[PDB]
Design a binder for these strands. Structure first.
Lengths: 56, 209
RNA sequence: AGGACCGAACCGACUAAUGUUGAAAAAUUAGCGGAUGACUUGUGGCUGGGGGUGAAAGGCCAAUCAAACCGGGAGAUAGCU
RNA sequence: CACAGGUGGUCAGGUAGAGAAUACCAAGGCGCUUGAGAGAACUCGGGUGAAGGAACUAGGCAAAAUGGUGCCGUAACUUC
RNA sequence: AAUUCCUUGUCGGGUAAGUUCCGACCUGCACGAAUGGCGUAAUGAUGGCCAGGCUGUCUCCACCCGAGACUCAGUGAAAUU
RNA sequence: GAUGUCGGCUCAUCACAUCCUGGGGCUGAAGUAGGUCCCAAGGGUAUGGCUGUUCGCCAUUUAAAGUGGUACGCGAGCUGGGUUUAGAACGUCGUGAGACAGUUCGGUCCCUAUCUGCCGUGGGCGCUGGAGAACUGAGGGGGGCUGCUCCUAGUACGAGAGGACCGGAGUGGACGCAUCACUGGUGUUCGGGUUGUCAUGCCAAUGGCACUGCCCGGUAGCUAAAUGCGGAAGAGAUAAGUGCUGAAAGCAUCUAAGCACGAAACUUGCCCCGAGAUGAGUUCUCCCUGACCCUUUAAGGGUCCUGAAGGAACGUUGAAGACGACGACGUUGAUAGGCCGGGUGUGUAAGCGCAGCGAUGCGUUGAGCUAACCGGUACUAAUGAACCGUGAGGCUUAACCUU
């Protein structure tokens, strides 16, 4: 139920070796708007694949 | 002898004139094309590598295309190897049809069993369920004891516990060959075979005999 | 008429499960007992520690009871750790 | 503790109902101060179940079952 | 026997099978007459036993609906050492 | 300054002094069936009544219901009937408080797993240029049970009664794996019936809530009670045991030389995993054929150009799945949803007309609706890109090009 010995800082780091986050490989660029966005996601200005989806 | 690669179409029944219903699994065995022949001199053993079906040309990788191109055959959905019993001769590009099973009368069917995911001991190992009442506390389907006291202060290897069940290679032996339809590339075998509909199956003549 | 009957409120706490570093230092859920009476409840009052009270279990007397709590004798004593 | 507990009195709508039970509602008041996905084992709270029907178990624990009104009818025993 | 050690006494009843139960027997280890004896209708969340009904209690588990468990974002404990 | 107990439950694992099955010697072994001893641990090895019981007795099964070790295995796995607190009685002891290893009724079982271990599943790096596949099998697991009936044969045997060995065939029990065609369960995502109540203005028709309100059916999926399959045969070397030839020892002798048989044990054969088998293996295929600079001049560093095979990522997703992983697909496209057709299920919708005072009935009508299913269909979403991964791959030696 509980530990018999205090795990080391080395053991703590070893467990956290798989906790590293992964950054997005790259961001797509809208063909017309030209702004960066997540692939398959609309841009911040409401564009997607150069179609100007609803932006209100 | 060598076997063939087919697809599990499904299950149906065959009504005999004597009033007997035979449960049959329909296996679609298209022509198997020999992509490579391995011999003792070069590979150290005798076998034939075959392919079946069709694959999108756009999705065939260049390393795979070159392998098919050398044999001069169209790409299939995969590659499988069959050992040769010291009396079989095959040539690259040869097509093997379901007629090979014409006079076999009994086959061994291998496939990937349906995946049950993370299964408990009751389902996976047929463990007996404990009492549903009479004071039982949160221990209705739990495994129970998993070892002995200090003397073997450890759990033995191979202990039956919960874990992945199914989705593994399984062979069912000695299945009667109900029908061999060369025209429709169909093979009917009495009984059920591993895997879901549309999965690949490896059919070989029965080894037990 | 009834320490009568069935049954809510109300007062209890027989069984089971849950919870057991709990939502809760005793509760929740489903059942359960009494429910015009030796009933239940609000407010105020009285009984004080070898004493109280007790349809009596050593029960209860501020989450503490085979002698409450607080301060004092007091740095009791400890051939024991 | 912004705690499933405890806390006396007063007010008492509609339909069904014997009813202040219960169900659904009015007036009125709330969705309980982490959410979003997934749809494994296992745990918790529930629903259903072939054939059998207490073989379970210390024990029918738990569950299932019975359940209302009217009429008919109702044993041993009894302090009537 | 809420009492009986020997003891699962013996016989009968109930069960295919009954150390329990019920009825007799009396060899009462170690009942007995207001620290009452023996009966007793009614009553009991009381102890034991047997039936009908009923069922996932069980043979033997299957599926399903929800709350967790699992993954993501925010916050962020504990015993132990 | 805590190593929790009897029995039950769950889950086991080993020993062999073997209960069954297998192989043998002897027999006061005719046969059938036994007795005794030897070999053998592969697998298998009851349910119930009573009692807290283990045990035991009893009932009825089985080829058999083995004996032991494992903290009298197993409570950070369950139980709490028993033992073993506080309540209360009986018998008994005591003047009494109380007591009994006498009985009797009642009586809180906590822990979110750090490490080892185990069951699963990933990440990293390695394997010497990189990459996509198919393999070899060192090694490791799984499996190994058995009844009954029939034929041989009413034969051998036996005075009869009774009744085989060896061999062959069929059909079962238990167990295991797979599967959903059938028989069924489930099916709160499908259809219908129905009670109370509220609402959609009202009628009609519907919806919410009442355990899915209560119910009746039921698709796919999952699933057992459902239906397929499995244990082997064979081979090698043996155990007890039986032998052949044969001396030491003129004989005898299974053994000393030599040679042949011999069991569910052993090694194989069957099934699964498996090259982190760092001893990192094999085969096939694919990709890369730049230009310079510095220097402590070497498996060195840096710049420019180049960015392949392939991979990953993202998206649509799956009979794959806890998450990773694995599989399919991404417009040169059926991956998912929708849509179209069909099937299946439910059981004749609504509206209107007719009959009836009415509740209802009838016609339109096997109607309407219909999830996960089947066959199709680019209508919607799966975007051009970007990102990772490079630029011929060390040294030594030997044989070949230049036998």
């Amino acid at each position: 139920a509980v530990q018999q010995n205090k795990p080391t800082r080395s053991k703590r780091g070893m467990r956290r070796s798989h906790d590293a986050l992964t950054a997005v490989t790259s961001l797509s660029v809208d063909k017309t708007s030209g702004e960066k966005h997540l692939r398959h996601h609309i841009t911040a200005d409401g564009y997607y694949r150069g179609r100007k989806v609803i932006a209100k | 002898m060598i076997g063939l690669v087919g697809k599990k179409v499904g299950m149906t029944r065959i009504f005999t004139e004597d009033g007997v219903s035979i449960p049959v699994t329909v296996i679609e065995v298209e022509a198997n094309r020999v992509t490579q022949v391995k011999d003792l001199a070069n590979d150290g053993y005798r076998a034939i590598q075959v392919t079946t079906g069709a694959k999108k040309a756009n999705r065939v990788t260049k390393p795979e295309a070159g392998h098919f191109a050398k044999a001069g055959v169209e790409a299939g959905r995969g590659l499988w190897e069959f050992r040769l019993a010291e009396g079989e001769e095959f040539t690259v590009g040869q097509s093997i049809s379901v007629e090979l099973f014409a006079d076999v009368k009994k086959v061994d069917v291998t496939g990937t069993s349906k995946g049950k995911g993370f299964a408990g001991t009751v389902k996976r190992w047929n463990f007996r369920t404990q009492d549903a009442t009479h004071g039982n506390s949160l221990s209705h389907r739990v495994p129970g004891s998993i070892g002995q006291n200090q003397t073997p202060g450890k759990v033995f290897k191979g202990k039956k516990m919960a874990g992945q069940m199914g989705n593994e290679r399984v062979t069912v032996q000695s299945l009667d060959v109900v029908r061999v339809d060369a025209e429709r590339n169909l093979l009917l075998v009495k009984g059920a075979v591993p895997g879901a509909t549309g999965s690949d199956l490896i059919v070989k003549p029965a080894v037990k005999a």
